[PDB]
Amino acid sequence: TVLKIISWNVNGLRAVHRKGFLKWFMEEKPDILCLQEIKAAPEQLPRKLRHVEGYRSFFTPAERKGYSGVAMYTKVPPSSLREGFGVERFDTEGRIQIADFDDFLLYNIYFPNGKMSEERLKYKLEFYDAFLEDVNRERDSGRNVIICGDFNTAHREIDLARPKENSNVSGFLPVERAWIDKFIENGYVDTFRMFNSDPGQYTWWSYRTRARERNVGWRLDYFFVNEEFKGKVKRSWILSDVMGSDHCPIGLEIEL
Ligand SMILES: [Mg+2]
């Protein structure tokens, strides 16, 4: 039995709905769909918009109105979800949704963008720190873990079109890249690279400067699993032709 999980930074749920979201979701039929950047008060969402037949849904909004926010659709519900690491400043931005399924925890994470300022870059790296602490704690206790979402960093030079010009832009700073190295070193596997070693494989393109048509993109969205669980991973891929956001969806298929 295959379980298909999709992750997508939709850049606003209302926006992606105007651009074919429901038709796409109906045709793709994942078992679990993880979404980032909802940008909406869930309580203000009409049912025609939020509810999708055959799926349970769970929404984790930011304190700040219209900002960030994540959500999860699933055919089979988790036993519960956790919405933070236990650290106030990281738990109030609508960035963390951790669902407990039988066989794994599924981390649906919208990691912070560090471009804004040195303070937001500091926040990003310390968020990374708190995340690693959290997943390590769970992984240490014998849990298998799947982590998906927008990491807001391209790992290696192959993971973006313009590595040299972005050497001092947040998203490709040596400090950020080094954290992904560290995360991997700690026993988590970048599942896409298990199957695809090719260049030009990205998940985000600026809406500006015709980036998507020029494939001037960055691989910012990942599926990671812990080392012990990797044997269950059968596919990890990029749904590059799916429109509606500045990111495209990514997919994981696992056999349990
Ligand atoms: Mg966005």
UniProtKB/Swiss-Prot annotation:
Keywords: DNA damage, DNA repair, DNA-binding, Hydrolase, Lyase, Magnesium, Metal-binding. Its cofactor is Mg(2+). InterPro entries: AP_endonuc_1, AP_endonuclease_F1_BS, Endo/exonu/phosph_ase_sf, Endo/exonuclease/phosphatase. The keyword Zinc does not apply. The active site is at residue 150. GO terms for molecular function: class I DNA-(apurinic or apyrimidinic site) endonuclease activity; DNA binding; double-stranded DNA 3'-5' DNA exonuclease activity; endonuclease activity; metal ion binding; phosphoric diester hydrolase activity. Pfam families: Exo_endo_phos. The insertion of the side chain of Arg-208 into the DNA helical base stack seems to be crucial for the uridine recognition. This is DNA uridine endonuclease. It comes from Methanothermobacter thermautotrophicus (strain ATCC 29096 / DSM 1053 / JCM 10044 / NBRC 100330 / Delta H).
